[PDB]
Amino acid sequence: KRQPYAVSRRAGHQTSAESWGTGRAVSRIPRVPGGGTHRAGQGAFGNMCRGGRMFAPTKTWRKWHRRVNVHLRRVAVASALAATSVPSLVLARGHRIETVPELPLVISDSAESIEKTSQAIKILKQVGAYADAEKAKDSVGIRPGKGKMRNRRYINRKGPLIVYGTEGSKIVKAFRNLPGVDVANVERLNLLDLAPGGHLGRFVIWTESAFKKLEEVYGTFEAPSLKKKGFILPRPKMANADLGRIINSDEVQ
């Protein structure tokens, strides 16, 4: 999503300047030849000169965008989706889920019909997911550094991510003014939301329709079992990651 930046192609080269050579007790850098002004005789055309040219001027044909294999992107989303269901990894990301009834946190399809921000706040309180939204509402502050002076003045933590399925619901409107709370549709889940900052464990609230659709999308280990053509769920390298139950088994011991 990055926009390219570069310096001018002229940028320190629009002067007429030649080297004086040797025989005058000065360095051989090119110099402004005018006369009658302070610029006359000053260094030019050099990364080391005031008003010169940058060493390797940034050009616009840098590689800004990066290609990822479609299959590898689907594996990453499936791995980030499963991390959202174990509550320990969600807490490790900083989400406040102490009063969340069940972490997979499937909510009835009635929430798909709410259309007020106050209604959305009421829904979050019922499912125990409002302390996460409060933390995101707090901590909103000015970004330190130069990005302040650019068009990024405020930063905050992430709150819950709400997933709906109907494709026409007004739940998107009811939640879009809450800071740190994102709304996603199940058919176009984004890895940037599932693992913010490259850290797995986003706090996700599923509406029932979205959760039921979660098997149509992403399918299973069977080949034609999903919408994504040419994709199967990845297989773990270790069928049972319980190290204690393998080391302390009868056959091993």
């Binding site: 926009q3 390219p4 050009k59 616009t60 044909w61």
Partner: protein, 200 residues
């Protein structure tokens, strides 16, 4: 050059940096093309958005002999065999290609059939309230006439895969398929010498 590398061939000896073409306008090109497609669709509300009807042709050259695709337009002979005047065809959504010819019968028949299928699906609106014209449709047919999107008449590329089960006869064997290929190649390369001796 210092090691076991490929011989380098970099075509960067000219002022290539004044001729760099970036693609930062690629998502904007996609939106501009999408917007014009919606404007064109509204400009012709009931007419199909995919353009006029196209024929079926074989791609030329031996590499693409066996693939079919859309052509430019229908031949003047195909339109005549389907009953459609060549001046009327463009006005009712059929493409005309006076350059193309029909050398084989099967290619011609499948295109004539395509026009007949199109004519059974076409609904023509009268150019006035009075339906004095002949090719116009009944009021019921016009009353429910929507706009179709995409390819309403798809083209099949390549012969469909079909493994059959057959009994291998005693003539199917001992055919000597490699020998047939070699003798036919010889008959080709011996033709000029054979014709020379025949003339003498």
């Amino acid at each position: 050059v210092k090691h076991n590398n490929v011989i380098p061939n970099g075509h960067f000896k000219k002022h290539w940096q004044n001729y760099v073409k970036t693609w930062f306008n690629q998502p904007a090109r996609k939106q501009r093309r999408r917007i014009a497609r919606q404007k064109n669709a509204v400009k012709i509300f009931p007419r199909p958005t995919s353009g006029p009807l196209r024929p079926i042709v074989q791609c030329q050259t031996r590499k693409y002999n066996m693939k079919a695709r859309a052509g430019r337009g229908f031949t003047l002979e195909e339109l005549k065999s389907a009953g459609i005047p060549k001046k009327l065809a463009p006005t009712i959504g059929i493409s005309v290609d006076h350059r193309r010819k029909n050398r084989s019968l099967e290619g011609m028949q499948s295109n004539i059939q395509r026009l007949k299928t199109y004519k059974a699906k076409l609904v023509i609106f009268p150019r006035r309230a009075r339906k004095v014209k002949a090719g116009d449709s009944t009021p019921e047919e016009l009353a429910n006439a929507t706009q179709v999107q995409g390819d309403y008449m798809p083209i099949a590329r390549g012969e469909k895969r079909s493994v059959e089960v057959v009994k291998v006869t005693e003539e199917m064997k001992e055919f000597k398929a490699y020998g047939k290929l070699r003798v036919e190649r010889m008959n080709q390369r011996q033709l000029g010498a054979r014709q020379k001796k025949a003339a003498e």
